[PDB]
Design a binder for this molecule. Structure first.
Ligand SMILES: CCCCCCCC/C=C\CCCCCCCC(=O)OC[C@H](COP(=O)(O)OCCN)OC(=O)CCCCCCC/C=C\CCCCCCCC
Ligand SMILES: CCCCCCCC/C=C\CCCCCCCC(=O)OC[C@H](COP(=O)(O)OCCN)OC(=O)CCCCCCC/C=C\CCCCCCCC
Ligand SMILES: CCCCCCCC/C=C\CCCCCCCC(=O)OC[C@H](COP(=O)(O)OCCN)OC(=O)CCCCCCC/C=C\CCCCCCCC
Ligand SMILES: CCCCCCCC/C=C\CCCCCCCC(=O)OC[C@H](COP(=O)(O)OCCN)OC(=O)CCCCCCC/C=C\CCCCCCCC
Ligand SMILES: CCCCCCCC/C=C\CCCCCCCC(=O)OC[C@H](COP(=O)(O)OCCN)OC(=O)CCCCCCC/C=C\CCCCCCCC
Ligand SMILES: CCCCCCCC/C=C\CCCCCCCC(=O)OC[C@H](COP(=O)(O)OCCN)OC(=O)CCCCCCC/C=C\CCCCCCCC
Ligand SMILES: CCCCCCCC/C=C\CCCCCCCC(=O)OC[C@H](COP(=O)(O)OCCN)OC(=O)CCCCCCC/C=C\CCCCCCCC
Ligand SMILES: CCCCCCCC/C=C\CCCCCCCC(=O)OC[C@H](COP(=O)(O)OCCN)OC(=O)CCCCCCC/C=C\CCCCCCCC
Ligand SMILES: CCCCCCCC/C=C\CCCCCCCC(=O)OC[C@H](COP(=O)(O)OCCN)OC(=O)CCCCCCC/C=C\CCCCCCCC
Ligand SMILES: [Cl-]
Ligand SMILES: [Cl-]
Ligand SMILES: [Cl-]
Ligand SMILES: [Cl-]
Ligand SMILES: [Cl-]
Lengths: 312, 312, 312, 312, 312
């Protein structure tokens, strides 16, 4: 109803704390996730002080109305959180303990430069706006920050959930505001990617390469082109789940490299057939024997160079 | 309006019970499901006692306001439940009878190690938070727990719906809480999977294997590569549904084994043609004669070993 | 405000009636549909009887509040209905007339044993709970049950919309309840399935069979395997719509039969080539000539037997 | 608060009008579209009359409450419209002006007998129910019916938006009601369907037909079968957008014709090879030469006949 | 709740300014996007002026009630905005400062004529409605127009965010109306489209063109038709992330030209074989060696013509 008047000019400090209960629905393309947690607040209000002995009580309980509650808002949320007050209590000296449970949908960008083996950081921002009569700043209560042991994300491993103690103060629309940053660090579970994507791709590439041990043109054409079709199908399957980015990723580089290898293999088969038709089997044999060793070695070297370039 | 005052120090016991009406929309990828049921509560409040003869009635009826109702919440839910009050009744001694119908969406992890033939357990958690003046604990009323005869889940057989009668008491946010566990056990209906997935795969594999009775290189290449493409399409269709897990499952192992078999078949065809083109037909005949028996036997042994290793 | 007291022991009867306006969005996979209709209720209340001559009116109008209105609920709904009251009228003798318009989503199982040519029956259940002082039952008013001539479902034909007059009375949660059943009978529009699915599949099967008039092994292999791939694509397209069931259907049986036929055709082609290579070009000719007649006759007999089994 | 009393028996007249602002999301399969428009009403209430000279004003503004506003509903909507009141004004003689902005989702059937080149009419129905003391009818005010110049429908051309002047008075649920019809006429933009769907299909068909200038059986088999597979893929793509209908459309007829043509082409290739193997080259040459001319002419004639049938 | 006093004859001017916070969910299918931003207002009221020394205060803080605030809405929104008032303050003069936060779903047309390399402009329209007693106009405050540094859209770059100073005044529904225009210029990030789309397509086309260096008819048929199948599959891959619009875009022209080139290549191969089978090798050799040069040059010239036509 009315913010507590200051003594002389001191600001009002509000202690915050978030306790995660459930987190779920991490969408890569939409770059969002949903959360379910507690919100804890604590400040000072001398007007509500009382004598414990006179009143015969040690804790008083107030309804959300008929009491001043600061307005805390999340910055990067799609809609205002749906919340419900759990409990409000007042201490004899004037300290107020506030608790509520909410749910919200949070927007946060993701970095996909190492997509199969990447780690991400998700941010939650709290802000408060100063009133025309009092200045309000935020702080962090280290005891009230935490998460449940049952919190799970489908496909991710949760590492930590901390908060930066120092807030950021800035002027927005001729008023002063304070901001807090809560960080949740997660890592991707990449085990399922190996036997479901990587190994079949290598098998198909080897089946394509086995055409350097034959001399029949039609069989070579069939092998190479059909393996190319299989590669296109796998590429569609993989790309349906990876969002478009303005930079170069590991997976895209590997896929482009495989396309280039298929093109060069077709070129080699055509060259060998053309040489053999003109009655020059010696050059064709030399080229084929050279390619048999040239292709895997260059593939391995290029893969090693790419790994050093993206993880070094 | 105010919790009942204790006689001397005793905690308040609230008897609960859930009666299922509808359960539906089990999402394997999101690991969620939707529920629709009754919620029953009963506690003791001596402030509402009355004299039957003086009043002339047997049971009174109050509105949800101007009466104290304990705050019960679900832990693993996406949002607060949609509630409505059905009936409130008070006995002459003071016992209160409460009834309510709700609906919610519940989060619960799943285990996919035996995906076609797996059985799951779904959990619902009830919690109550103690007030600053009284201690509250939960209890189970066995005569109020059950389900309808028409409760059906598309694709699952429902086996039982019970509750663990021992609650868990702990501290959180400087208060004591009590939690209850309700367990629903289901089994997947695996009949449709056999003639839709398992047998076409075997027929395609046998069609691929029929290439050990031939000597034409082009026909063998066409057979094997076309069957491989069909296998890839089937694998994509299967994987569209099953999610990604940090552990190996039965279906993934089988699919990887089939990929390995196709690779070895291509190698065998290439080796046979290479040996024949060098005017060594006896060795090629010996190798293909061995392969005709070697492939199905090793396949059968591999599936027997995998089935023992995953289900025993 | 309070249920009307009885005379001695008579129960309270409520006359119901549902008039369909819009029914739409029948999902086969979820087995749900959406409805929009009118709900009519009528009962007796002697506490509201008035003298028409004194009042000067033939009918009195009341608000939804300030008058006791029984609570009627739908059993098989995902959420509570969204309703708005249209009018309330009271006759001088005390009979109360009620009206409202609602919209809800109804859960109802379906049977797919004859999927292309099946018929269904959708159920809507109405229930009422007895108050402690009065016992309430339900009755059907045949003069207020019907549907608009413009009620249309996409892909279905509507036959009738009736109600079962006899209510089912039982006990639930220490109270007596009455239940009514409204049945909507529909049939499927199967014309679009024939030229879109059935005929192309037969054409592809005949194209596959055309290989019994040829002796070129490579051409036969190409024909049979490519037609198998086309069959797989069509099967995936069909399977995207029909959900999984714990029993066998007509379409699944036909698809499995086609897979078996393709396998046998591949075996026959391989056998003919093998016998020709061994320099016995008479048994191969006999087998091919036999198969030319054997395949269509067996296909026709099997289709007749399956059609008799599923629709007889 | 109460319907105005008549002079002797005349019905109350309400004048309506709809001004379109937005129209979007026209779903072919669901047969729904979304709207955003102003709603205008005007009636007569003599009890609100005042003398402007004594009052000192020319227009009096009333809150939506404490005044009688007629209940107007939309018949073919999924849910009740979401609206807010804009302005209410009363003329000195008693005439009331009312304005409101709403949004709704409408249901309307569609016709697909000429799917690429079809024209549709969308209906919006307004209804009102008579009260027990007064009779209400609806009229049309042509000065308040129209649409914005920024109204755009993705894929359609908006032609006109009018209202049928004569309402439909009928008795429903023992009460007389009046209904109005608003019609919006749209036409489909078919240009993008030509180069994206139509011409590639012709190119693939001609590629299939080019096999009448060769005598190599394997090449002809490969050509025809692979082009059939490509046709199947397009057909799936095209079908994934057009809903199933209980009648026959133009596109389905063309697609079935293409399937028939592929079947007959395969038959011709088989016949030619069989005749050539039997040392009868003259008949095979004559048949191939005849087919070279026969196929395109019959295709063109069938297309002309179908176009005449579906557009004449 | 009183409109500000009109001093002689003058309209009321309101200074508006929108400060962006979040932008997300830009759907090209429905041409919609969600926004989250501030809204600043400022106008004048004679009565609210108060003496500073008499009160010993600088600025007051009025509730939404007991004060008059102009109603301002957005033309292009599916539903009304969800707003919560943040701060209302009054200077020592009659000037009032108003602030609020809102979220909305905006409808704005999109253009994809240059789809990969296109730029779009998003519009937000602010409108105030005049009352029967006072005229209202809208102004623009440049110090309140801004955009956060953390505003991001998935796959787009944000160029600028300004407003058009000049309103548009027009009469609608017998009332004078004023409008404002806020424009947000964006451009699409096209880097990822080169290695994902452009280069694989070129590789496939070159693989198809490699058939001008061979004589084997079967190999040429296999190459060209299988590359056509790969082209159709990659068309599916491209179309999976392209809005379904009735447009004549750059991509559609490219794909149609590719289809034409495939058709002409098939025609050339057929002509070469047909000439060769009649013992005219010189003409076939000449045609092949001419096509080797003709195809790429014509392809490049057509590409240049299309690029100059669409981007000129
Ligand atoms: C034989 C071929 C390879 C078979 C095994 C494939 C997987 C090998 C790696 C598994 C474990 C990697 C790991 O622990 O990663 C952790 C670690 C995380 O580092 P940061 O903390 O971000 O620094 O990751 C790495 O260092 C990754 C190093 C490079 C891994 C390369 C894995 C193989 C890549 C694909 C090669 C073949 C491509 C075939 C087609 C693929 C199409 C997508
Ligand atoms: C636009 C650019 C792409 C245009 C379409 C490219 C189609 C593929 C080209 C394949 C050419 C094969 C010709 C061939 O084998 O020639 C053999 C030729 C003749 O040798 P002699 O008999 O001594 O004379 O010898 C060779 O193999 C020379 C080397 C040719 C291959 C290396 C260059 C390939 C260039 C591809 C460019 C793609 C971009
Ligand atoms: C990286 C590794 C993979 C690289 C690409 C692999 C291509 C596929 C391998 C091709 C095998 C064909 C070899 C072949 O025909 O050799 C026959 C050869 C000829 O010997 P002589 O008669 O003395 O001459 O004899 C044989 O049969 C040898 C058997 C070799 C095949 C067994 C090993 C297969 C290799 C799999 C690698 C997996 C990684
Ligand atoms: C290869 C040759 C052509 C293959 C054609 C495949 C389709 C054949 C399907 C035949 C079929 O559906 O038969 C239906 C029908 C059986 O009666 P139902 O209607 O199924 O009985 C319902 C009541 N108990 O069969 C017939 O009588 C058809 C005529 C058979 C004799 C010729
Ligand atoms: C070889 C050369 C092939 C040339 C024809 C193919 C290119 C054009 C095909 C589409 C025709 C477009 C112009 C005609 C349509 C038109 O005028 O539209 C307006 C008008 C509005 O309709 P109503 O007023 O109700 O009558 O439309 C019509 O009148 C349509 C009349 C139908 C005749 C044209 C139909 C042609 C389409 C089929 C062509 C062959 C199909 C090939 C395979 C297609 C596979 C999906
Ligand atoms: C059940 C219906 C479908 C059954 C499966 C169909 C398989 C494909 C049939 C192909 C027939 C080819 C006949 C052939 O090559 O021989 C030509 C044969 C033999 O010539 P002579 O030595 O003079 O005797 O003579 C002919 O030209 C007969 C004409 C056959 C083609 C027309 C009928 C094809 C099938 C139509 C029925 C299905 C629709
Ligand atoms: C293979 C050879 C070429 C195949 C060409 C495919 C496309 C042909 C489509 C012809 C077509 O659509 O004709 C339309 C049209 C029918 O008249 P509509 O305006 O549709 O009907 C209104 C009167 N009741 O037919 C014609 O006029 C045919 C003109 C073409 C003749 C050459
Ligand atoms: C070999 C080609 C390899 C490079 C392909 C991409 C080249 C263009 C990259 C840079 C584009 C650029 O500068 O964009 C800015 C600029 C923006 O201009 P406005 O201000 O809107 O006028 O873009 C342009 O003007 C683009 C000009 C045309 C670019 C054409 C790029 C190549 C297109 C494909 C050609 C080959 C087709 C192969 C199949 C493709 C299937 C989709
Ligand atoms: C209606 C349009 C589509 C009709 C169906 C098209 C099927 C494919 C056509 C293939 C043509 C091949 C003809 C051929 O090889 O003839 C060679 C022919 C024989 O000449 P002589 O030795 O004097 O006899 O000589 C040539 O190469 C002439 C050039 C003809 C082919 C070029 C034009 C093809 C027309 C296609 C139009 C498509 C629109
Ligand atoms: Cl918030
Ligand atoms: Cl809850
Ligand atoms: Cl209900
Ligand atoms: Cl409505
Ligand atoms: Cl708004």
């Amino acid at each position: 109803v009315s913010p507590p008047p200051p003594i002389a000019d001191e600001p009002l400090t509000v202690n915050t704390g978030i306790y995660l209960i459930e987190c779920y629905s991490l969408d890569d393309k939409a770059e969002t996730f949903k959360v379910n947690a507690f919100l804890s607040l604590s400040w000072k209000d001398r007007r509500l002080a009382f004598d414990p002995v006179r009143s015969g009580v040690r804790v008083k309980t107030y309804e959300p109305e008929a009491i001043w509650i600061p307005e805390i808002r999340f910055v990067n949320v799609e809609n205002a959180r749906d919340a419900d007050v759990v409990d409000i209590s007042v201490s004899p000296d004037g300290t107020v303990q506030y608790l509520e449970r909410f749910s919200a949908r949070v927007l946060s960008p993701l970095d996909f430069r190492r997509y199969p083996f990447d780690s991400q950081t998700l941010h939650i921002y709290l802000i408060v706006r100063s009133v025309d009569t009092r200045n309000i700043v935020l702080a962090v209560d280290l005891e009230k920050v935490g998460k449940n042991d049952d919190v799970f994300l489908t496909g991710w491993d949760i590492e930590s959930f901390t908060a930066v103690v120092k807030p950021a103060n800035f002027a927005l629309e001729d008023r002063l505001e304070s901001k807090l940053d809560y960080q949740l660090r997660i890592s991707r579970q990449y085990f399922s990617y190996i036997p479901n994507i990587i190994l079949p791709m290598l098998f198909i590439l080897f089946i394509s390469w086995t055409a350097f041990w034959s001399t029949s043109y039609e069989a070579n054409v069939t092998l190479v082109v059909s393996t190319l079709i299989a590669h296109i199908a796998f590429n569609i399957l993989v790309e349906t789940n990876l969002p478009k980015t303005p930079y170069m990723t590991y997976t895209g580089a590997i896929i482009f490299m495989i396309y280039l290898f298929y093109f060069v293999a077709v070129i080699e088969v055509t060259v060998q057939h053309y040489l053999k038709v003109e009655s020059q089997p010696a050059r064709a044999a030399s080229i084929t024997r050279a390619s048999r060793i040239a292709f895997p070695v260059v593939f391995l070297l290029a893969n090693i160079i790419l790994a050093f370039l993206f993880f070094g």
